[PDB]
Nucleic acid binder design. Structure first.
Lengths: 249, 708, 735, 23
RNA sequence: AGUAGAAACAAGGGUCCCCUGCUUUUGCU
């Protein structure tokens, strides 16, 4: 409904009609990145300089009707001015704080499921047991390890198709799933992700983070395992070793 | 055959057929039998779907819902999308291949085919090709023959008759054209075309001019390279090459290196953004943490505590400036402070009047007018911007005194670090006690006071510059400290008036006027204060051990400038700590790996271990780990305060000489290829920066001490 | 007592305190005005180091070009560009002989890559030069403008979306007799063949900033869209070759590079033991990019691609050919001032060709006089050298080939050598029975390098017994030591947003603990300092404090409203619960269980207007410029919350004639956003389709409406309304 | 921990020129 | 004046008022 009405509104204009009709789907990858904004050269300096301004942040137009124009202390939260090259509006950081105290609350029960990797990390740390510290000469060998506890040994292609099946079932295309592991993973993810309002792109990114194995060259000294490379910063030192056992297998 | 097909079909059918065949990358003008087959298939499928709606109950209707959904005549992406959506919503498992259309009353995929050959042959062929048992197959024939699965005809007899009649009449037209016999359909062979990428025209002409001198065309060069074999080419041309081309190794012995040559000229002068060792602060007692109270209120209170103000007069004039303007600026600051005092409401910021003295001191309207070249090309004195080397200066003894003062211990704490998570691991407890030692040693260092002052000043200047770029704003210089008695104190060093700050580039300059209290008589080291105009503003009755002694109080007033990048890097001075602290930790840990125990407590408390850190008339002086930490902190702070390209170049070049000297000290037989070149590279970075000159002098001292 | 920190080296070895020698707490040097002087100096230096070559006049661009290949052999130790073709081919042949099949397998892999690469792959660049506008633009904008102009000039081979098709389009456009471009009030401009050819071969020059370890600024260059694809394919082939070479320092990371260095050091040490001497040279090449010739790269590419399809060889050959005929823009020009009249004016570089020289100082006048013969259409002809320096991998291949020439079977003597090469940097190790053999090997390596246009810098290099050395600020002293100062600038507020900044700060502390020997106590103090800086930068001081900021009132209200204060994020005035043990846990999930239900729901609300997600490649990914090296991509762990906002953009373009593009961008976004509402996966994986936006949109809308009606989610009235609107769109598209 | 330094002179700094007491 | 250093800033555009603060200038593994 809203989609087709917006498409009609776009087609009403001449320039938008020309853009829509004369651009193919392949050319979209190019025209969507078309921008006059240069990638920031000194983000730290720019951030320090911008935080002294009234409206350094950008927000969607909906904010206009979702938070008041001014504070209880007559502090303006957003300005009508549009961000350059877009329909977003300039807002002050106060608005964010306002949303964090007076914004519309929503149920957050899929978040631990969607961000399963981070909460697995925190649960592993919570149930870990520490041992003594031993002061001795530490020998570190630069070895290739995998920083990904719980990955399902899926490469780019297979993980991407599983994510496509889970998050965008109708856009999977010609590919089909054969390995029983992929089928069970897809079924479990679909069951657990049912009725999830988190952004589909974020869900896909988290699934990729959880399913695809990553590797890195690191100066390891002790056990070479994902759960141990996860706390390498905590366990190994220049002259000390901290005995530790993660609370997750 | 092309014109017959194009003129006997709805433009939509033919257009869909062209788009479909182009999606495969074929040529419509070359292959036409496939075009005819696909166009007939589209026509028959559309007749199948056309005139078939579904009512509310779900029964047939002939002229709302559409009974059939077409799959053919669409891009692979869209066809796959439609089949996937149908399979997901309805529940019917999708087929491996692409069907032709889908029926919904029976909720299953149906395939349509049009072939001259007998219905059974094509039916069996496609049935064993698709290998699907839940998808209908409906084969038609040019002669009217037709059959489907289990003889189950999904479409009404009238619709089937219409399809047969249309196929028969199009076949009759094909026969009339006479090309009916030589059609025989055409099956997709899936041919593969080799890639080609030719170089011709201007490109070949350019390529023919991008070759070694003795080749005329790219083809000749390619032929030469393809048949090339190595036949002692490198050996022969090494034989031919002159022996003057060599990398002769010059032994680096203890008698080889020489001291660096420092530049000659007038003594260097102070260039920091605020006074370091000559700063004087007026203090008050108040229970406020860092950056809590209103700066102007605190400055007014600090001013109140001092009795003994005097009519200001010039003591040491700025040679190149207008000193009465500085005097008037100080008087205006005092008057504006009185005005805010008699207001009963203290604003967060105060805007100073744009008086003539402040207009001059802040460089108002000093930029030349920007005009087009055609309008000024005839001006007699028009010329390129001065782009000469900076004037050279000789090292002065005040920078070493500044560093010595910055390395000292103070009675007050200058930094209060934020909370962190509770310690739960034994290593965390060890780190906590070690960090207690580090924080104690670093919080009571003068360099830390400089860090705090610089961070505060740069933060205030940057915030004012962004917030109000058209006003002259008065910014008090304030710091907070805790005395050895544990009581909080707010100190005022002076005042800053910023100028217009329309800062566009990262190197754009905002000018400001700094007025700083001091007890140092400028006449003792005049060359250090070349940029300053120093006044006498009062007589302070200092309380000393024996009794009380009167001392004049001076106001160092100068015009300075800073940019966005300099302000940003001054706001991040706290990281200086890390540098020194890191180096300290690695020194303790290195010594703790050989004794199998932590030596932090031993190092800091007993001071058993010392490192050579100083120079005395008697010889090299050794300091404790805390002294080393404070010295490295002071070095980092002075690197931050006296940053310049000279420092970067000197550090980079002198690192190599330090490494070579170290290799000599390790008895690794070092050698150099051009040592005088390295010395020249090092010495070209020593021009006028007092910090860099002091670093070079330090290097000379280390060099004379390291080779004996 | 005069404190002298350098004296600390009397007890602590220089390497073990190397961090003391890096002044990376102050601001780095920056350029202030024009880079035209640096560009002219670079051009003159490039033409001087190869001046004993053949001068030719290009028949296409009419430009004077210098060819130093196979020139007179060097007679002194000054930098030389007279590389020998036979020597380069011999080095390549011996490299192939030592690693049989390397070139063939690399060519097969690159041939597979060439046919699958898409044109949109060129959007992952940075400030590409735009010939249509004659100025630097972001890579995507430049590519879009080039495609628009090609389409308007009847060059539409790129509709297929393949990169090679776009290269064919560029090839054809090179042959066009007239190019029509649009200049902003739209105006039509016509370029003749020579003018367009000069524009297509132009490199835009500027001056580098934030460079450490140098006293003088230098000039860098960026090419246009006409050569980027060819360079991409050449660099893909060079990367494939480098990956199979153990002596190559690219494209591996720092830790793997250190592992390779340690491996080679150990290999050269065990062999010697006690029967021969081994010496390490901590080397450095001078004028690396000013003495590498595109013709030599053409020769190496030709040799590598022997016995390969003709099209592949042509595609790989194009880039060296175009770099051999390159032209350089001379920056912005100069600024003149009049003290008497108090005036300042800008003189564009294009006027340097025929401007009176009375305005300039002696050095600038000499530069202009020396460069005048090379000036054409406001650009300088630069045949020799690699100013832009985009062949960082082919140069690595050449260096590795020279290193491989050091095997005992190639030296045919008692001495031999091995080491590592990374672009212009290299570490060498020569083993020989005695010091005379060491000198002989060093001389042989130096002369062989000279034969292929590589000039070792004698003033920045030294040699010592192979126990210690340095390689690109990695200091090895019987094992690699830590250099923490190199990472000091990365400690601070990155400047992305609150969530990303917190995550990046904590991650940087953790990584420096792992890699740079950051101690536990120092790690805790760094955490404290980062939290302080974060609170000050984002004005998110703790709710209970009395620090006065514009954000203080809202933070205080949130603090007083909250029950479990430990659950609040630091961005929301909460406490800092981070320590060493939990540096690997994102903040939101660190205190997830301590947060109030309502605060948690508000913070993690997907309907919040502050969060905006771009394509997946930019999710939880930031671009960070290190102190040394090019900008890198760093991935951080963070939960998408209301603190993942986006800062505003520069608005200066509103005051220029290019303002028209802004609206254009806006329009595109609208369309693209609408496309997401019909193909939600488009932001996850790039969609492919030859059809237009409109057709796919209407097809998807019709299908979704019908399926939803079938499922009973929408009444018949809504289905009819949607079908009517879709029919309206279909009929409106035609007219 | 109270940092101390041997260079501390109890008498040479009669008054601190940076942070003196002036009533 | 001052910043600064091989070239720049010391406001720049537009028609009291309006716009702008990286956008004629930041490459490459």
């Amino acid at each position: 409904m809203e989609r087709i009405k917006e498409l009609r509104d776009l087609m009403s204009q001449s320039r938008t009609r020309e853009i829509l009709t004369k651009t193919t789907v392949d050319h979209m990858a190019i025209i969507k990145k078309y921008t006059s904004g240069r990638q920031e050269k000194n983000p730290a300096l720019r951030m320090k300089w911008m935080m002294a301004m009234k409206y350094p942040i950008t927000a969607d137009k909906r904010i206009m009707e979702m938070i008041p124009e001014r504070n209880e202390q007559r502090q303006t939260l957003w300005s009508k001015t549009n961000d350059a090259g877009s329909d977003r509006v300039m807002v002050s950081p106060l608005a964010v704080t306002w949303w964090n105290r007076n914004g519309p609350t929503t149920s957050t029960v899929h978040y631990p499921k969607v961000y399963k990797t981070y909460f697995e990390k925190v649960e592993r740390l919570k149930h870990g047991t520490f041992g003594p510290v031993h002061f001795r000469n530490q020998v570190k060998i630069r070895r290739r390890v995998d920083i990904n506890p719980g990955h399902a040994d899926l490469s780019a292609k297979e993980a991407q198709d599983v994510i496509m099946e889970v998050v965008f079932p109708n856009e999977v295309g010609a590919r089909i799933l054969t390995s029983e592991s992929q089928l069970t993973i897809t079924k479990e993810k679909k069951k657990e992700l049912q009725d999830c309002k988190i952004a589909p792109l974020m869900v896909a990114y988290m699934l990729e983070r959880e399913l695809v194995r990553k590797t890195r060259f690191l100066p390891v000294a002790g056990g070479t395992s994902s759960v141990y490379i996860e706390v390498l910063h905590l366990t190994q030192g220049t002259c000390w070793e901290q005995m530790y056992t993660p609370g997750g297998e | 055959m092309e014109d017959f097909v194009r003129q006997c079909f709805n433009p939509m059918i033919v257009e869909l057929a062209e788009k479909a065949m182009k999606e495969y990358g074929e040529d419509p003008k070359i292959e036409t039998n496939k075009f005819a087959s696909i166009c007939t298939h589209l026509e028959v499928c559309f007749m199948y779907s056309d005139f078939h709606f579904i009512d509310e109950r779900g029964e047939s209707t002939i002229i709302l819902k559409h009974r059939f959904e077409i799959i053919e005549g669409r891009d692979r992406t869209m066809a796959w999308t439609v089949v996937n959506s149908i399979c997901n919503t309805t529940g019917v498992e999708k087929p491996k291949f692409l069907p032709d259309l889908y029926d919904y009353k029976e909720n299953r995929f149906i395939e349509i085919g049009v072939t001259r050959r007998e219905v059974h042959i094509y039916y069996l062929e496609k049935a064993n090709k698709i290998k699907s048992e839940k998808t209908h197959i409906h084969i038609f024939s040019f002669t009217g023959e037709e059959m489907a699965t289990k003889a189950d005809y999904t479409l009404d007899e009238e619709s089937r008759a219409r399809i047969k009649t249309r196929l028969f009449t199009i076949r009759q037209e094909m026969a009339s054209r006479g090309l009916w016999d030589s059609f025989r359909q055409s099956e997709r062979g899936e041919e593969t075309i080799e890639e080609r990428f030719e170089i011709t025209g201007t490109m070949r002409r350019l390529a023919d001019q991008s070759l070694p001198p003795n080749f005329s065309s790219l083809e000749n060069f390619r032929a030469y390279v393809d048949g090339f074999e190595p036949n002692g080419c490198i050996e022969g041309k090494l034989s031919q090459m002159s022996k003057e081309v060599n990398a002769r190794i010059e032994p680096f012995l203890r008698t080889t290196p020489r001291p660096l040559r420092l530049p000659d000229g007038p003594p260097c002068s102070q260039r920091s953004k605020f006074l370091l060792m000559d700063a004087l602060k007026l203090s008050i007692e108040d229970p406020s943490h860092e950056g809590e109270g209103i700066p102007l209120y605190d400055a007014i209170k600090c001013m109140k505590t001092f009795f003994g103000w005097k009519e200001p007069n010039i003591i040491k004039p700025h040679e190149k400036g207008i000193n009465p303007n500085y005097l008037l600026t100080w008087k205006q600051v005092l008057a504006e402070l009185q005005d805010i005092k008699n207001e009963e409401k203290i604003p967060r910021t105060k805007n100073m009047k744009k008086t003539s003295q402040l207009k001059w001191a802040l460089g108002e309207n000093m930029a030349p007018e920007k005009v087009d070249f055609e309008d000024c090309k005839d001006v007699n004195d028009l010329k390129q911007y001065d782009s000469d080397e900076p004037e050279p200066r000789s090292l002065a003894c005040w920078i070493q005194s500044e560093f010595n003062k910055a390395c000292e211990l103070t009675d007050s704490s200058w930094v209060e670090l934020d909370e962190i998570g509770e310690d739960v691991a034994p290593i965390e407890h060890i780190a906590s006690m070690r960090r207690n030692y580090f924080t104690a040693e670093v919080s009571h260092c003068r360099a830390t006071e400089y860090i705090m002052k610089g961070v505060y000043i740069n933060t205030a200047l940057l915030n004012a510059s962004c917030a109000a770029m058209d006003d002259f704003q008065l910014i008090p210089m304030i710091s907070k400290c805790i005395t050895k008695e544990g009581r909080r104190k707010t100190n005022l060093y002076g005042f800053i008036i910023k100028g217009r700050s329309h800062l566009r580039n990262d190197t754009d300059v905002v000018n400001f006027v700094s007025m700083e209290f001091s007890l140092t008589d400028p006449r003792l080291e005049p060359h250090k204060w070349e940029k300053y105009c120093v006044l006498e503003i009062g007589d302070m009755l200092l309380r000393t051990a024996v009794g009380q002694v009167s001392r004049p109080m001076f106001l160092y007033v100068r015009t300075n400038g800073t940019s966005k990048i300099k302000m940003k890097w001054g706001m991040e001075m706290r990281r200086c700590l890390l540098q020194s602290l890191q180096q300290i930790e690695s020194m303790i840990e290195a010594e703790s790996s050989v004794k199998e125990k932590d030596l932090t407590k031993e190092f800091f408390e007993n001071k058993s271990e010392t490192w050579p850190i100083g120079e005395s008339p008697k010889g090299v002086e050794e300091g404790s780990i805390g002294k080393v930490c404070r010295t490295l902190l002071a070095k980092s702070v002075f690197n931050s305060l006296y940053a310049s390209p000279q420092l970067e170049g000197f550090s980079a070049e002198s690192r190599k000489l330090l490494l070579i000297v170290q290799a000599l000290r390790d008895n690794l037989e070092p050698g150099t290829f051009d040592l005088e070149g390295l010395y020249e590279a090092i010495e070209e970075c020593l021009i006028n920066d007092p910090w860099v000159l002091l670093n070079a002098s330090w290097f000379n001292s280390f060099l004379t001490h390291a080779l004996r | 007592m005069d404190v002298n920190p350098t004296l600390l080296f009397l007890k602590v070895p220089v390497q073990n305190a190397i961090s003391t020698t890096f002044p990376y707490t102050g601001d780095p040097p920056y350029s202030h005005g024009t880079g035209t002087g640096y560009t002219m100096d670079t051009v003159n230096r490039t033409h001087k180091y190869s001046e004993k070559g053949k001068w030719t006049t290009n028949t296409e661009t009419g430009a004077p070009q210098l060819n130093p290949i196979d020139g007179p052999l060097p007679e002194d130790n000054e930098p030389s560009g007279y590389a020998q073709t036979d020597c380069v081919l011999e080095a390549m042949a011996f490299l192939e002989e030592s690693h049989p099949g390397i070139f063939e397998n690399s060519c097969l892999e690159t041939m597979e890559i060439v046919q699958q690469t898409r044109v949109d792959k060129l959007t992952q660049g940075r400030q590409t030069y735009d010939w249509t506008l004659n100025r630097n633009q972001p890579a995507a904008t430049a590519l879009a403008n080039t495609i628009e102009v090609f389409r308007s000039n009847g060059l539409t081979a790129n509709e297929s979306g393949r990169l090679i098709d776009f290269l064919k389009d560029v090839m054809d456009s090179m042959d066009k007799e007239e190019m029509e471009i649009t200049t902003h009030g739209k105006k039509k401009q016509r370029l003749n063949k020579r003018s367009y050819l000069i524009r297509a071969l132009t490199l835009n020059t500027m001056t580098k900033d934030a460079e450490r370890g140098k006293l003088k600024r230098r000039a860098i260059a960026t090419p246009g869209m006409q050569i980027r694809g060819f360079v991409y394919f050449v660099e893909a082939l060079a990367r494939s070759i480098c990956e199979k070479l153990e002596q190559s320092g690219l494209p591996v990371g720092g830790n793997e590079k250190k592992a390779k260095l340690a491996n080679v050091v150990r290999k050269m040490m065990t062999n010697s033991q006690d029967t021969e001497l081994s010496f390490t040279i901590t080397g450095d090449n001078t004028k690396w990019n000013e003495n590498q010739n595109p013709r030599m790269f053409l020769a190496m590419i030709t040799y590598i691609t022997r016995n390969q399809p003709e099209w592949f060889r042509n595609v790989l050959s194009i880039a060296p050919i175009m770099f051999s005929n390159k032209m350089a823009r001379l920056g912005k020009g100069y600024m003149f001032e009049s003290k008497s009249m108090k005036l300042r004016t800008q003189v564009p570089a294009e006027m340097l060709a025929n401007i009176d020289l009375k305005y300039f100082n002696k050095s600038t006048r000499e530069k202009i006089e020396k460069i005048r013969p090379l000036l054409i259409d406001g650009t300088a002809s630069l045949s020799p050298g690699m100013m832009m320096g985009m062949f960082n991998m082919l140069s690595t291949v050449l260096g590795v080939s020279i290193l491989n020439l050091g095997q005992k079977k190639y030296t045919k003597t008692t001495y031999w050598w091995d080491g590592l090469q990374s672009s212009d940097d290299f570490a060498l190790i020569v083993n020989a029975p005695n010091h005379e053999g060491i000198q002989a090997g060093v001389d042989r390596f130096y002369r062989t390098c000279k034969l292929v246009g590589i000039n070792m810098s004698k003033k920045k290099s030294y040699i010592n017994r192979t126990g210690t050395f340095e390689f690109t600020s990695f200091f090895y002293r019987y094992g690699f030591v830590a250099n923490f100062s190199m990472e000091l600038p990365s400690f601070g507020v990155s400047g992305i947003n609150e969530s990303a900044d917190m995550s990046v700060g904590v991650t940087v502390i953790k990584n420096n603990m792992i890699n740079n020997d950051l101690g536990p106590a120092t790690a805790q103090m760094a955490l404290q300092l980062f939290i302080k800086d974060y609170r000050y930068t984002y004005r998110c001081h703790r709710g209970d404090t009395q620090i006065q900021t514009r954000r203080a009132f809202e933070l205080g209200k949130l603090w007083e409203q909250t029950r479990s204060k430990a659950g609040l994020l630091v961005s929301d005035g909460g406490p800092n619960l981070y320590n060493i043990r939990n540096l690997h846990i994102p903040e939101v999930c660190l205190k997830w269980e301590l947060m109030d239900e309502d605060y948690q729901g508000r913070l993690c609300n997907p309907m919040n207007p502050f969060v905006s997600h771009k394509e997946i490649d930019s999710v939880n990914n930031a671009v960070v410029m290190p102190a040394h090296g090019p900008a890198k991509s760093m991935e951080y762990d963070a939960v998408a919350t209301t603190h993942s906002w986006i800062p505003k953009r520069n608005r200066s373009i509103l005051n220029t004639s290019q303002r028209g593009i802004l609206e254009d961008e806006q329009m595109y976004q609208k369309c693209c956003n609408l496309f997401e509402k019909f193909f939600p996966s488009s932001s996850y994986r790039r969609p492919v389709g030859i059809s237009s936006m409109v057709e796919a949109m209407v097809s998807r809308a019709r299908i979704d409406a019908r399926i939803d009606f079938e499922s009973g989610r929408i009444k018949k009235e809504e289905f009819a309304e949607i079908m009517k609107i879709c029919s309206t769109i279909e009929e409106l598209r035609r007219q | 921990y109270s940092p101390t330094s041997p260079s501390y002179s109890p008498t040479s700094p009669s008054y601190s020129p940076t942070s003196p007491s002036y009533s």
